[PDB]
Design a protein around this ligand. Sequence first.
Ligand SMILES: *[B@-]1(O)O[C@@H](C#N)c2ccccc21
Ligand SMILES: [Cl-]
Ligand code: NA
Ligand code: NA
Length: 261
Amino acid sequence: ADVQQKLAELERQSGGRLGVALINTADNSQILYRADERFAMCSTSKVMAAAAVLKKSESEPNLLNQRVEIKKSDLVNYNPIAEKHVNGTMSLAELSAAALQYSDNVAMNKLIAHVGGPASVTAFARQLGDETFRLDRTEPTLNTAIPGDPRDTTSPRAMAQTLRNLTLGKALGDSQRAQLVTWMKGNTTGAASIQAGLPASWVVGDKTGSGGYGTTNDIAVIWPKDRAPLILVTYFTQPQPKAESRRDVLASAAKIVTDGL
Ligand SMILES: *[B@-]1(O)O[C@@H](C#N)c2ccccc21
Ligand SMILES: [Cl-]
Ligand code: NA
Ligand code: NA
């Protein structure tokens, strides 16, 4: 309401297109802004790839220990962990951690490959009840974020509801859900995004995304002090192909929607 006016002003100031969905699990309420529009997920899609592997591991519990070769031919444009393991192997657990905690693009590609490709990550989403998410490309091209292009997009509403299912619901088994949350709480890449708009005492598990057109995203499960958890998706994209990242916009959106909680 007033929060709606504040998000609209933030969007206006920012010069881009802002998408927000907050779920407050205390009362099952939502704050939504462009929450049914599509946005390029960029690296926030790494959550869904890792979750698809975790789901597969429920019925193949040795899956996370399976070794995957890292070759020079696997390197792409952002390989902080994988580059250190070239000519060796990483387990699917290590690749999941690398994708979620360091945003490693080789790791993402290995997760995608294992489950069967981008369309298999999408099928996992569908099987959960998310009929909006679509993963269509591998790294690095899934981050082009061209205006009007539906590839590799979802909506804030759908991603918030799915993140809630994965982290606070029981889409995943007890061990797998705990593992996803632990991985997201150990993210090294999120302190300037949603977390920067929340009090220091609050605990956050998040995954950021960056891409073309200044696309700057974050999805988070939040444990506020002495309150039930929140789910927050903040997606942002800009009109210029070479626009700079705007993590401050995500921090501001997070501050706006959590004011009073
Ligand atoms: B994600 O959008 O893809 C990676 C690249 N390039 C990356 C690095 C750091 C944060 C988010 C992402
Ligand atoms: Cl504080
Ligand atoms: Na989604
Ligand atoms: Na964050």
